[PDB]
């Protein structure tokens, strides 16, 4: 049994004319707690910022500790309405508090987005799904009606539904519907219909396989050279290009394990000047990985790839 810590965030005041100072200080204060190891992490719309951009200080008075953390932001970022979270880790328990730019009024309306299945899910996992994501609804009274249908009138499978309250005060609702693999490949169209008593009309989204022409991806993988400093970091890259249609899944494989998606970054598909789209993927690797096995495979899953909807290429950093 220990006394609860509490968390509050104060911020710089804008001046007597209503103008922001050129930098904004956020001061996260963790009031009196039982002495122990404590970590403070700042998040910007949920993503961890580098610890170099903030300070932290701990004092002890008597038998009680007090902690403060300071984060510095540009005026531009503060005015861009991003949400910032002070994350406190104390004895294996997490506390938190949130803030965004203040406002006199914060109107918002509901919006909706509908994804296609990923090629990886369609052709590797062999379990394709579609997701209808509805965000920025106002948490009024009542559940939001969300119905799936097919243009053919054939029956839909049972869907799963998640509702999750967000840091910015909205309620995001996600519905995931399994789709038939042959159904999707043969050009079926799926519709997500969103209703609510407070809406003026129904919101409708639909999705279907792209009717454009097909072209297989070309793949090229590379490693950067060795140079000072970056001795134990030898960033790898992969270029996937000249494919049609635009939907593609890129993964990295190493030593008979497909590494988690979060390890690497991947750009959004953009049009080439001539014919097709391209993406880049970037993967930072460590010394222990290439000393385990230095063969790293960039793999693309794409509807136009042959003979099995996959294309892959290996690279070795040493050669």
């Amino acid at each position: 049994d220990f006394t609860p810590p509490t968390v509050k965030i104060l911020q710089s005041s804008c001046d007597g004319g209503g103008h922001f100072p050129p930098t904004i200080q956020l001061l996260c204060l963790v009031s009196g707690y039982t002495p122990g190891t404590i970590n403070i992490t700042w998040l910007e719309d949920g993503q961890v910022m580098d610890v170099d951009l903030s300070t932290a200080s701990t004092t002890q008075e008597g038998e009680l500790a007090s902690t403060q953390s300071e984060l510095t932001l540009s005026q531009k970022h503060w005015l861009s309405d991003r949400t910032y979270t002070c994350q406190v880790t104390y004895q294996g328990h997490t506390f938190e508090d949130s803030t965004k730019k203040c406002a006199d009024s914060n109107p918002r309306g509901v919006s909706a987005y509908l994804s296609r299945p990923s090629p990886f899910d369609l052709f590797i996992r062999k379990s394709p799904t579609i997701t209808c994501l509805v965000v920025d609804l106002a948490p009024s009274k009542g559940t939001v009606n969300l119905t799936w249908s097919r243009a053919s009138g054939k029956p839909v499978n049972h869907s799963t539904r998640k509702e999750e309250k967000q840091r910015n005060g909205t309620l995001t609702v996600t519905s995931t519907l399994p789709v038939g693999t042959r159904d999707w490949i043969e050009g079926e169209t799926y519709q997500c219909r969103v209703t609510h008593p407070h809406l003026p009309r129904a919101l409708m989204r639909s999705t279907t396989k792209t009717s454009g022409p097909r072209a297989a991806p070309e793949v090229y993988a590379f490693a950067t050279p060795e140079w000072p400093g970056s001795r134990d970091k030898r960033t790898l890259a992969c270029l996937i290009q000249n494919f049609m249609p635009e939907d593609i899944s890129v993964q990295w494989l190493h030593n008979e394990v497909q590494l988690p998606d979060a390890r690497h970054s991947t750009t959004q598909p953009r049009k080439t000047k001539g014919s097709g789209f391209f993406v880049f993927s970037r993967l930072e690797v460590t010394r222990a990985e290439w000393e385990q096995k230095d063969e790293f495979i960039c793999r693309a899953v794409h509807e136009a790839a042959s003979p099995s909807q996959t294309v892959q290429r290996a690279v070795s950093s040493v050669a």
Binding site: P107, R108, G109, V110, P200, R201
Partner: protein, 169 residues
Amino acid sequence: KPKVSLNPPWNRIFKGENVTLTCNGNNFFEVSSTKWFHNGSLSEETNSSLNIVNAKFEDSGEYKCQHQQVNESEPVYLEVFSDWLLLQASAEVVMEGQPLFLRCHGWRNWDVYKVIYYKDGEALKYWYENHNISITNATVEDSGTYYCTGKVWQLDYESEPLNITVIKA
């Protein structure tokens, strides 16, 4: 004959809104009772004013009234929509120099921002918040298919277009 008046004047409403059809003429015959004709069927209202409360989709269609005369009162038409933005208009056919009020209206008194009216494709006028357009002398060139783009709850909504045509008196 009598004519049919609308309060509010707008023959295009949203679902759930009210409207009251009043209808009157020269008092050659004293005002005793009236007959109402929704779609063609006689309505169960005697009173000179019919209160169409909480509109449903079936409340659309041709409206008409009648008295103890021998001839009927023209077929005013009432369209009912459910949508985000309805560009309401005073009258669908006008004679030069009469007032014309246009108003890009949002569901349940909601405030539509960044409102721009289009007449036949070109941007007729833009104002930051919602506004009326008000033309007191509608020219023969004022005839056009109108529509308005607006911003409700930060999101963009276009109204369904409505063609209107002026005539020479």
